[PDB]
């Protein structure tokens, strides 16, 4: 039966990325913003290789990102959807059923503004999955997910429209 309880869509994880193009104080302040929003210590990503045009070098600390799961992820997701006024595009959903958007100012989320911190834009990505994804992530007996149980673009789009009363454009 396609109308089974275990086929219920629900959020697996939310990943917050700030790719400040340089290293030092500004990246640290972006990390402070992320630790404020999520309540968890974020992790800084280093450039995998060197590009002179972007002013980055290999192993220079460029970006910072953090993964949130559970109720806090839901709260942050709706806090960010308010800034987007609940309106994403069709282009925004991947074939694997994940979606993302990008805010431009981190004070729109609803946290105190500090002149020392300044404003950073931010990137939001939500990873969707049904129950049983542990099969692909456990150590022993790792396997694949059946086709009906797979997450795709259409199922995620319909679930998003139903659960958030938002509009999915297509411009």
């Amino acid at each position: 039966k396609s109308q089974n309880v275990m086929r219920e869509l629900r959020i697996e994880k939310l990943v917050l990325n700030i790719c400040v193009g340089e290293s030092g104080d500004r990246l640290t302040r972006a990390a402070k913003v992320l630790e404020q929003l999520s309540g968890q210590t974020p992790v800084q990503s280093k450039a995998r290789y060197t590009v002179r045009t972007f002013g980055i070098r290999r192993n220079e600390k460029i970006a910072v990102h953090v993964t949130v799961r559970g109720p806090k992820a839901e709260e942050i997701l709706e806090r960010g959807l308010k800034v987007k006024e609940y309106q994403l595009r069709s282009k925004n959903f991947s074939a694997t059923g994940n979606f993302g958007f990008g805010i431009d100012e981190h004070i729109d989320l609803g946290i105190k503004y500090d002149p020392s911190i300044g404003i950073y834009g931010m990137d939001f990505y939500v990873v969707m999955g049904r129950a049983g994804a542990r099969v692909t992530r456990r150590k022993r007996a790792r396997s694949t997910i059946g086709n009906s149980h797979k997450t795709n673009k259409e199922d995620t789009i319909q679930w998003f429209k139903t659960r958030y009363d938002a509009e999915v454009l297509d411009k």
């Binding site: 992790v43 800084q44 995998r48 290789y49 060197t50 590009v51 290999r58 600390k61």
Partner: peptide, 21 residues
């Protein structure tokens, strides 16, 4: 502190192929 991954094995400045028109 936090970062320590790069499970890859990169060469030098290797801006990867891509880099074209």
């Amino acid at each position: 502190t936090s970062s320590k991954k790069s499970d890859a094995a990169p060469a030098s400045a290797d801006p990867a192929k891509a880099k074209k028109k």
